[PDB]
Amino acid sequence: LLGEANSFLEVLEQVSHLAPLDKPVLIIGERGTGKELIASRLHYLSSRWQGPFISLNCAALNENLLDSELFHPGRFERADGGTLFLDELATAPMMVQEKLLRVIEYGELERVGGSQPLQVNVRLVCATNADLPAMVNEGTFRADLLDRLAFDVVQLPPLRERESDIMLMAEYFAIQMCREIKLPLFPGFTERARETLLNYRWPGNIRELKNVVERSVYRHGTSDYPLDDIIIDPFKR
Ligand SMILES: Nc1ncnc2c1ncn2[C@@H]1O[C@H](COP(=O)(O)OP(=O)(O)OP(=O)(O)O)[C@@H](O)[C@H]1O
């Protein structure tokens, strides 16, 4: 994990204290900010580290199949003894959100008839970029679920608020790309390059930075001169 920005370092410190708890954690941050990497850290730094790390994006699946996917068997079942990461929570159906509250509140998976309810031992982590308290007031997120799910909140800073890290990360990603394309040395970034990198708002944050930098190193294609042209938008040219 790259970064030295105070705001990022306070997140890592926080994660180190939260990881051993069995309490549910909410991660707030923009796309591409490393929320999944932090969730993975919460799992590997916990007592449950030898246990499974199951993950699921509540947008990587049809709305009507969330239920049965979550609770065919489900992610909870798979994460038993382990940890479950749920990205994109602010677009889960209310019923899944009320059922989610029940699994949190009661520690067991509801079973209709026949089978008795299934006891699970799962550390939960969720992630989003909504003002969840705003979705509660909007009738789009359950006030009761939030009152219990947000035991604590990890706020991951966007890249534009970790401005000291933009060049550190850009240089790392550029060097890795130089290795991929067999250039002998990364020749550096011009000041024009650095202005471009630092003045851009990075709506896709670290994912976007890596792709931008890699593309730019490739287009440049040489170690003879410093990299001047940062290609933010490949759809222009
Ligand atoms: N601190 C970091 N150091 C190096 N790479 C990072 C860092 N944080 C994120 N990245 C990289 O950026 C990309 C996105 O990270 P990740 O998927 O964890 O973020 P995310 O917030 O979960 O994104 P999204 O919700 O949009 O899927 C990945 O390539 C990841 O390796």
UniProtKB/Swiss-Prot annotation:
Q: Briefly describe activity regulation.
A: ATPase activity is inhibited by interaction with PspA. Under inducing conditions, the interaction is disrupted, allowing activation of psp transcription.
UniProt keywords, alphabetically: Activator, ATP-binding, Cytoplasm, DNA-binding, Nucleotide-binding, Transcription, Transcription regulation, Two-component regulatory system
Give the subcellular location. Cytoplasm
Give all residue intervals belonging to the Sigma-54 factor interaction domain: 8-217
- Give the main location: cytoplasm
Task: Tell me the residue numbers annotated for binding ATP.
Answer: 29-36, 79-88
Any Gene Ontology CC annotation: transcription regulator complex
Q: Is the Cytoplasm keyword given for this protein?
A: yes
Q: Would you kindly state one Gene Ontology biological process term found in this protein's UniProt entry?
A: regulation of cellular response to stress
Could you tell me one molecular function GO term of this UniProt entry? DNA-binding transcription activator activity
The protein's role, per its UniProt record: Transcriptional activator for the phage shock protein (psp) operon (pspABCDE) and pspG gene.
SUBUNIT field: Forms a complex with PspA, which is composed of around 6 PspF subunits and 6 PspA subunits.
Q: What is this protein called?
A: Psp operon transcriptional activator
Q: Which organism is it from?
A: Escherichia coli (strain K12)
Note the residue range shown relative to the complete protein: 8 to 257 of 325
